[PDB]
From a paper:
The crystal structure of NgSAT was solved by molecular replacement to 2.01 Å with l-malate (from the crystallization condition) bound in the active site. The C-terminal tail adopts two conformations, with the tails of two monomers in the trimer extending away from the trimer and the remaining monomer exhibiting a folded tail conformation. Data show the presence of l-malate (present in the crystallization condition) forming meaningful active site interactions in the structure. The most notable difference in active site coordination is where the l-serine γ hydroxyl forms meaningful hydrogen bonds to flanking His162 and His197, whereas in the NgSAT malate bound structure the equivalent carboxylic acid group maintains a hydrogen bond with His197 but is orientated away from the catalytic His162, and is co-ordinated by the backbone amide of Gly188. In the extended tail conformation with an ‘open’ active site there are seven water molecules interacting with l-malate, whereas in the tucked tail conformation with a ‘closed’ active site there are an additional two water molecules coordinating with l-malate. The ‘closed’ active site recruits additional residues Gly188 and Gln261 to join Arg95 and Gly190 in solvent interactions and residues Ser189, Lys223, Asp260 and Gln261 become involved in tail interactions. Glutamine 261 is noted to be of particular importance in this ‘closed’ active site conformation as this has key interactions securing the tail position and involvement in the active site chemistry, drawing in additional water molecules. Competitive inhibition is supported by the observation that in cysteine-bound SAT structures from other bacteria, the flexible C-terminal tail of SAT is folded against the active site, as also seen in the ‘closed’ active sites in our NgSAT structure.
SAT synthesizes O-acetylserine from substrates l-serine and acetyl coenzyme A and is a key enzyme for regulating cellular cysteine levels by feedback inhibition of l-cysteine, and its involvement in the cysteine synthase complex. Using X-ray crystallography, we have solved the structures of NgSAT with the non-natural ligand, l-malate (present in the crystallization screen) to 2.01 Å and with the natural substrate l-serine (2.80 Å) bound. Both structures are hexamers, with each monomer displaying the characteristic left-handed parallel β-helix domain of the acyltransferase superfamily of enzymes. The six active site residues in N. gonorrhoeae comprise of Asp96, Asp161 and His162 from the left monomer and Asp147, Glu170, Arg196 and His197 from the right monomer, with His162 and Asp147 forming the catalytic dyad.
Residue numbers in the entry:
A (entry chain E), F (entry chain E): 4 to 7, 11 to 74, 78 to 265
B (entry chain C), E (entry chain C): 4 to 8, 11 to 249, 255 to 264
C (entry chain A), D (entry chain A): 3 to 9, 11 to 264
């Protein structure tokens, strides 16, 4: 794997094996993965498969997705490696690529965010709605998402217009990065690097979640959370430090 | 807008013609869903049937059923208009009336339910149960056809909303995704919440049993409410306790 | 007439309910005839309806139907679980007064039975197919159950939306679960890491049960609880985090109900 | 009972035939209820069924249905032609013993009525739409009729496959046409260049009638003929090229049929 | 092949596995249509239902109807096998048994008709009329369900073929596209041709009325036949005249 | 027009006008024509729209059609100009491109012929069948078709495995270029340049049709036809010269 490497080449090897083992899916795997020359082309194809509709032709969606910021494709690879690292249900890179709804919703949003920043708001709203119907995930096209993100299970995830997510964040299903008040402007959470958010937690308002903080499942967070702090409860309260500094751990290993 | 000026239908058409001009690949969708029609109700029946049509019941048949149900009770479309105005007022992500009309899952689920409720009360329970399941699959929203919903309702995001058979909702209520207006016990009879006017319910809160929520109460996100809530009280926690609204949408629970 | 007051054919009662619905609703008559009345068994009906739900251009409904039919034929315990589930929903859900209502229209019943077949496909080594269907189930039903999760009989998953059960989750028999419930994992390592739920448990809406913990038989998890430690039998737990707050059962010695009829 | 022996409601007879078919064939009951029985008029049924045939992802069936309904409402002569056609098929086709059979299942009847609406759309200036539908008709029905072609009432196009009628073709009333017939043009120039067919004509299978020629009333074109010159009334023509070979009608003075009952 | 060796079903599977290996985007189609099945009849029911399925009657329902009809008369599949062998023998464009099975419109129309005929004789006339129209739309072939077809029949290209209510076809007949076995008159009763064994009919020929075509006659392309044709006679022209066969497929008319 | 020129540019102008006049079709015209950069890309898109099916994804067909011999695209343009010239029902180039089934069947065959020559016979047979179902046209993938062809109406056209067509030929619906005998090898007609074939004519066997010959509608041709000859009847017989030499016509015009 990538921790001991060509991601695209490994996905091709996993997929050709799956196609050989499952004749039911051979032509799906060949048309979605093997006939393509790059991971980005595969992703555009598979995402258009998911979100295409009578209104929005899969071919038209596929072309738009292919035409979409080479930074997006760098985030995609980081996201895939993050899932491999952090999700014990994932032992193959092609498993989230083809079958993890939260991975799909994140990458669909990245493209949606580009279309929205390009001024194609009606199209982005149409696709925001389609993502919510098909993936059970509602991300406002203006939300800004860093790389190395994992959205495990995904169902019920909500992130609003002014939400900002840093890098290497892990999020469970049912999580809300929600707004407060009836006025526009900054009103959704900003999440620092390294944060973990447990299932069905809510983070509400224009509050900051510090780097490497941990939000326990079921928490309702309505105030800032300092870096390296764990919060729990309804409403959420600091209960522990989420990570130990080297000076606290005193780990003397120097091998690796 | 409706707070400044106002013709809701004409504003929607003007917004839609603008969208079609800007996004030519959506132009025919917008012309067929909105601009070719002559009333808001016909647009709603068309768009809802596009969402919920399936092999079992195709978009054409559902369109005719929806037009017939709307025609049988002209007040449904009145609640539709009130809901659209409520979303415009209360949701800062909404600056155009046609945005919830066309793209907000919670708006579609609520109006789909109003038609289901009409069909159910007409005695068409099997059809209403089919459509309840269809709404749950497509929108992620489970509303029993017997539930009674007022006007000026906003269901933001919508995913995971549940309201059961004996639930009753007043007017000008605001609800977030994940909210449960759920039952208790294995017996029939009144067993679901009754929600007063002006109430706001935060994300993933649950309200369970035959209990009353007083007018203008606020249910904090993540709250679990199992007993009556007096008017103008704010409750937070699991179980929820009084500690301190559909118009203001303030989500603070501290 | 029902399974609680008649010495009772589930399949024939479902056929009779369906013939009645078809005569009352011409809009749905041919669906009911193709999905229910033209079939010879409840298992064939279920395989047909489920493949209708999860089929796609990728996965032909006819092929899925045959796969589901063969899987039901390969593991006849599944159909017995199916029957127990329908009776459980009839017994416990006051919105259910007919057996064909959950069979045709309750998404939580569909997701459970789709998983039972999915689990069989997984055990037979069709893991790619099982992962494809896990994803399809999550999309169509809003329910994410790992194919390796183990589910007993007499289960009710009411409303269903948002239910999650992970790779090493185990559910016993006669369990009742509301929408939004999580039987979730902890940590980045493989091995046993999801809850094991004993017989008779009730789990309320949007509760989360996390880690390799045991929920004892007849326990009750209140709506919205977050459970991160073992829960002993016959205990009710509430809160975030969840704490024991009461005994879950009323003993006959406490009730003093003297009826013998 | 029918239109030849009852002083007769076409629409209500069609409803009665359809209710009978729906009760006998549960596979088709909901189609018959959605296509026929839930409607209030034959024109609404026709618009619904035709849009089912010619609709596509490009052209939403619901939009086409409304366009066809408005076109039928804009030109109430079309529905009168529709009724004449159904009676003509009942009278002349021995395979037809029920009025709803061509209405629902005869491709030549569908193509003719689709053209009548197509012609109206063309005259109103919706030429792009009419060309789109001309192509759709050719694909789905195997029938190519230019939107500018003019068709009278009481027409039967039996089997239909391969029928072609070009831009300046004109068909009178009470004409019978078999599959494979061509009312075709000649030359690379615009202007009148297709046949004009008089009342009462019969045209046999795979005949071709080419150029700006006139086929006189009550003429008969035998199957397989190629007609490139005018044909006078009451004449039968046969061959490649076609030549007059007989008189097409038996006069009462020749038959000497003395019945007065 | 069946003239050299022979197992038709096994040869079809071997051909199909070869095709799937060569054309990976068709592999799942071939596995789902052919290789997953255990008999030729089940493949035919599956593939015909893929062709004729529609919103009114979906591929699944038609598949079950077709399997039931085939199961009710095991001789249909016998005629299917004879037809496939006839096409292999007589059509130089056919060097594999699975090519007509999967890709020849005329083969599909004929087998679709055999099922229609069974349904029609069972009394399911409405369903048979629906499928007759469906066959006409999809295949360009109009065969009345009451028509009687023998075995070893080949309909090459098929487009425009018409056979009416009282038509009767013998065995080992070869027919090209555009051929009419048509009626005459406005009255019921026998009014369509009866075709003897071994007859060959060229492209776009018509045979009209209650007339008999003798065994091994040859009908030239473009012929119009309105009276009986004796056995082993070749006729050409409009109207057709004797001037001088399903195995040899010689199209000369001079 | 091209007789008094950019074909692709004229089609774009015709199509933008049609889109402006017909809101029902605006997004179809935009997705099929206007969003593309070349006529070949439009043709690949529209053909895949016609022949796509559940088995054969429109995206997969579109990619294959786009990947398909830059001579094919030259024939396409010649075919479009031929229809404009010869068909009085055609006064716009985009009319046959989008709505003439015979134009579609010919171009679909050209691509099919390339796939077949590349050895993808199963795919070509699949598409031959699909063309026959959707267009009512049966052309064997091995048939070789020249440029400047017009197939007017198209329904019932049949051309077999060894048929060869030259350039600037005009063919009506119902025409058969058919084989004879049960053996392989050359057994279908070879059609010379400039030929016209009328409706429902049949040309059978390994016979040669000479350049600028004319086959009357309803003819059955079973022997060679010399250049510049018109044949009529069942069976067909020479009846006239089809074109006049300059020496026969004595036209003295020298203007144009
Ligand atoms: Na992992
Ligand atoms: Na607003
Ligand atoms: Na119950
Ligand atoms: Na009749
Ligand atoms: Na052969
Ligand atoms: Na022209």
């Amino acid at each position: 794997n990538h921790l001991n490497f060509d991601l695209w080449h490994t996905i091709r090897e996993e997929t050709a094996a799956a196609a050989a083992a499952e004749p039911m899916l051979a032509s799906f795997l060949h048309q979605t993965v093997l006939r393509h020359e790059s991971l980005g082309s595969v992703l555009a194809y598979h995402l258009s498969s998911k979100l295409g509709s009578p209104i929005m032709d899969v071919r038209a969606l596929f072309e738009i997705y292919q035409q979409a910021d080479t930074q997006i494709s760098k985030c995609v690879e980081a996201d895939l490696k993050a899932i491999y690292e952090r999700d014990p249900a994932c032992d193959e890179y092609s498993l989230p690529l083809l079958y993890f709804k939260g991975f799909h919703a994140i990458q669909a949003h990245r493209i949606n965010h580009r279309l929205y920043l390009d001024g194609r708001k009606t199209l982005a709203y149409f696709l925001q709605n389609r993502m919510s119907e098909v993936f059970g995930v509602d991300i406002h096209p203006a939300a800004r998402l860093g790389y190395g993100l994992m959205l495990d299970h995904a169902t019920g995830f909500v992130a609003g217009e002014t939400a900002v997510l840093g890098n290497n964040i892990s999020i469970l299903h049912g999580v809300t990065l929600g707004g407060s008040g009836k006025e526009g402007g900054d009103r959704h959470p900003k999440i620092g690097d390294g944060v973990m958010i447990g299932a069905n937690a809510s983070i509400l308002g224009n509050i900051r979640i510090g780097s490497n903080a941990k939000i326990g499942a079921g928490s309702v967070v309505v105030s800032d959370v300092p870096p390296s702090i764990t919060v729990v409860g309804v409403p959420a309260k600091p209960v522990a430090r989420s990570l130990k500094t080297p000076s606290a751990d005193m780990d003397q290993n120097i091998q690796f």
